[PDB]
Amino acid sequence: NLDIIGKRIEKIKQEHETSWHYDQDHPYKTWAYHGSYETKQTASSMVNGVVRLLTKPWDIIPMVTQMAMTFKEKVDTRTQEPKEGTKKLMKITAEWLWKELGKKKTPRMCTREEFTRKVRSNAALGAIFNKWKSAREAVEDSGFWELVDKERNLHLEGKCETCVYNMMSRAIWYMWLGARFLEFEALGFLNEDHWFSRENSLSGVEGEGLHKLGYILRDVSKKEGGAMYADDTAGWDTRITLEDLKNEEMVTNHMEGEHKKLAEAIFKLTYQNKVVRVQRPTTVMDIISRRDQRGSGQVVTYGLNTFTNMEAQLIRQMEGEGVFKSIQHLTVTEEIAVKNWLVRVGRERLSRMAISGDDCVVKPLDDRFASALTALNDMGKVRKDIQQWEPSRGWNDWTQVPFCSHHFHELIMKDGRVLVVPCRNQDELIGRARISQGAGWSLRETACLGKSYAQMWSLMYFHRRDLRLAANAICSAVPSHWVPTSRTTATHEWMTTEDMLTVWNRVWIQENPWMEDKTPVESWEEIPYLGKREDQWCGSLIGLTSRATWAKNIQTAINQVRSLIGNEEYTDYMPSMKRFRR
Ligand SMILES: CN(Cc1cccc(F)c1)S(N)(=O)=O
Numbered sequence: 091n092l093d094i095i096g097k098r099i100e101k102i103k104q105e106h107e108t109s110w111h112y113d114q115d116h117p118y119k120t121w122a123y124h125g126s127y128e129t130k131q132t133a134s135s136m137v138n139g140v141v142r143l144l145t146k147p148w149d150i151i152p153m154v155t156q157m158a159m160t161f162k163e164k165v166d167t168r169t170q171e172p173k174e175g176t177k178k179l180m181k182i183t184a185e186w187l188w189k190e191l192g193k194k195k196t197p198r199m200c201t202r203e204e205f206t207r208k209v210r211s212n213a214a215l216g217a218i219f220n221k222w223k224s225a226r227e228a229v230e231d232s233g234f235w236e237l238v239d240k241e242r243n244l245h246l247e248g249k250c251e252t253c254v255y256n257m258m259s260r261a262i263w264y265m266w267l268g269a270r271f272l273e274f275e276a277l278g279f280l281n282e283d284h285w286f287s288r289e290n291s292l293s294g295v296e297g298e299g300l301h302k303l304g305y306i307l308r309d310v311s312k313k314e315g316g317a318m319y320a321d322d323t324a325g326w327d328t329r330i331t332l333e334d335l336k337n338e339e340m341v342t343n344h345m346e347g348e349h350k351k352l353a354e355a356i357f358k359l360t361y362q363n364k365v366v367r368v369q370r371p372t373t374v375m376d377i378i379s380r381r382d383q384r385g386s387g388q389v390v391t392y393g394l395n396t397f398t399n400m401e402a403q404l405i406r407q408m409e410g411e412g413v414f415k416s417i418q419h420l421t422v423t424e425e426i427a428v429k430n431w432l433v434r435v436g437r438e439r440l441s442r443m444a445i446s447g448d449d450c451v452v453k454p455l456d457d458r459f460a461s462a463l464t465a466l467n468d469m470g471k472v473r474k475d476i477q478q479w480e481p482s483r484g485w486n487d488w489t490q491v492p493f494c495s496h497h498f499h500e501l502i503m504k505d506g507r508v509l510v511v512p513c514r515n516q517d518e519l520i521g522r523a524r525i526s527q528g529a530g531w532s533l534r535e536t537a538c539l540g541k542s543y544a545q546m547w548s549l550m551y552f553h554r555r556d557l558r559l560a561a562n563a564i565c566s567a568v569p570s571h572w573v574p575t576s577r578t579t580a581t582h583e584w585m586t587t588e589d590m591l592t593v594w595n596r597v598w599i600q601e602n603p604w605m606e607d608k609t610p611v612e613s614w615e616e617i618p619y620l621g622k623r624e625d626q627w628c629g630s631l632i633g634l635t636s637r638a639t640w641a642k643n644i645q646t647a648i649n650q651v652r653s654l655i656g657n658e659e660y661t662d663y664m665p666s667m668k669r670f671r672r
């Protein structure tokens with residue numbers, strides 16, 4: 091315990107030596123508590139005026155307007171240690187899964203060079219405000235990298251000074267850039283080298299993109315078996331056990347030299363022991379520790395979640411096929427049976443799943459899976475919104491399965507080629523596009539974010555009548571050459587100034603491995619929509635009076651936004667649609 095966290099604690103204690111107060115009205119049972127010190131301050135969500143002015147009908151839809159306004163008693167919960175048979179099932183499965191993932195990959199260190207280019211084009215890594223302002227600055231100064239070297243040589247010693255979590259079912263723990271770097275050095279390879287790609291991992295979809303996920307679920311649907319199962323876990327990050335963290339760390343068994351020692355230190359000193367600074371209003375800072383749960387960086391969290399989820403689901407599949415009889419204790423003939431199952435059918439059983447971090451779809455061999463709940467509940471992966479021992483509901487149609495906040499439609503083009511397109515309730519799509527994160531944004535920055543949403547809609551949601559119209563209207567109201575932007579970048583093919591019809595053709599035809607005929611599409615009118623009734627089912631306003639006035643007078647809304655931005659070069663995209671083409 092305190093040998094490993096103490097140094098980190100001693101250090102923070104002294105940076106606030108005229109504050110430290112061992113409180114006894116501290117709200118922690120599950121989190122160990124060490125003391126407190128003085129602090130003050132707080133980050134809300136702003137409306138994007140460009141998107142809102144061009145989506146007026148939605149100004150009266152509460153599902154949209156409410157999204158822009160605004161359980162930490164789930165972080166203070168506790169999960170029992172699995173039984174011995176569960177622990178054996180998990181260790182055997184984890185050992186076998188790292189081997190399979192490593193068959194065609196070489197673990198390796200990520201570089202300062204790599205880390206630096208990352209910071210300069212942004213994929214929200216999670217830094218702090220203070221010695222430097224942004225992370226952009228700290229990365230150019232060689233002082234920083236001496237801070238990073240001091241800590242690096244400490245980790246090689248088996249000690250930690252500065253790797254401390256900052257807390258704010260969404261709980262996000264930011265660290266100072268230097269600790270993020272050391273995390274990236276050691277584990278970045280999982281993401282950077284695509285360990286959870288579908289080609290490499292069979293269950294994974296890392297790098298896949300929203301235009302590929304539907305085709306993937308459909309491929310899983312082809313497999314002979316029972317229903318498709320899509321159980322969400324109640325607070326996945328909060329149910330990661332010390333035993334889960336030890337099975338993840340076995341990736342170090344695949345490493346060597348310095349790398350191996352660097353990865354071991356991250357696992358031992360920052361994941362399997364943790365120090366967090368939490369802001370308490372009654373406003374002070376509480377310095378609390380615990381061994382279990384998830385608090386890596388967002389990107390390592392994703393790969394380790396995918397790994398442990400693949401593992402849980404192969405085991406749930408094992409329980410459904412009667413590979414083992416009780417989680418209480420595995421016999422020796424049962425270890426032999428588990429191992430031989432993995433060797434004989436493990437790759438086939440991985441190909442029956444689509445797993446994105448904590449999210450999964452499984453098409454098991456048959457419907458025994460639905461009531462195979464003992465290992466899943468004993469690993470602590472307790473299902474959301476169903477009684478502990480009530481069997482899982484199954485989906486009989488792959489176009490009804492929820493995955494990554496979406497469902498997928500099968501859509502036949504006038505020439506017979508088949509698109510599998512992503513979809514979610516349209517109020518959700520319009521409500522997110524109306525929101526900007528952070529403040530201090532020019533009218534040009536706001537316009538360029540609107541343009542990003544519009545281009546995403548044209549590429550992923552072209553089949554929704556209201557989104558194709560609104561996308562053409564936003565792209566008509568923002569200057570033709572202004573570059574789309576984002577502040578927390580799935581593959582993002584809409585982030586470009588290329589012609590959207592040209593990107594559509596590349597994404598949906600040329601690069602789509604499910605399309606045998608590569609004949610390009612010549613205009614947007616070749617590109618189909620969902621059926622009118624399906625469009626309404628998924629939240630369209632077609633048939634409403636508000637919507638008919640909006641569409642008919644769209645050029646007046648476009649002209650309102652153009653007048654606000656000013657005298658710039660604009661394109662009329664509205665004639666790409668039949669009803670505005672005269
Ligand atoms: C809502 N329908 C008509 C409609 C109005 C505007 C655009 C459309 F694409 C279709 S309906 N009642 O299903 O025919």
Ligand SMILES: [Zn+2]
Nearest residue numbers: 250251252253
């Ligand atoms: Zn450290």
Ligand SMILES: [Zn+2]
Nearest residue numbers: 497513514628
């Ligand atoms: Zn839909």
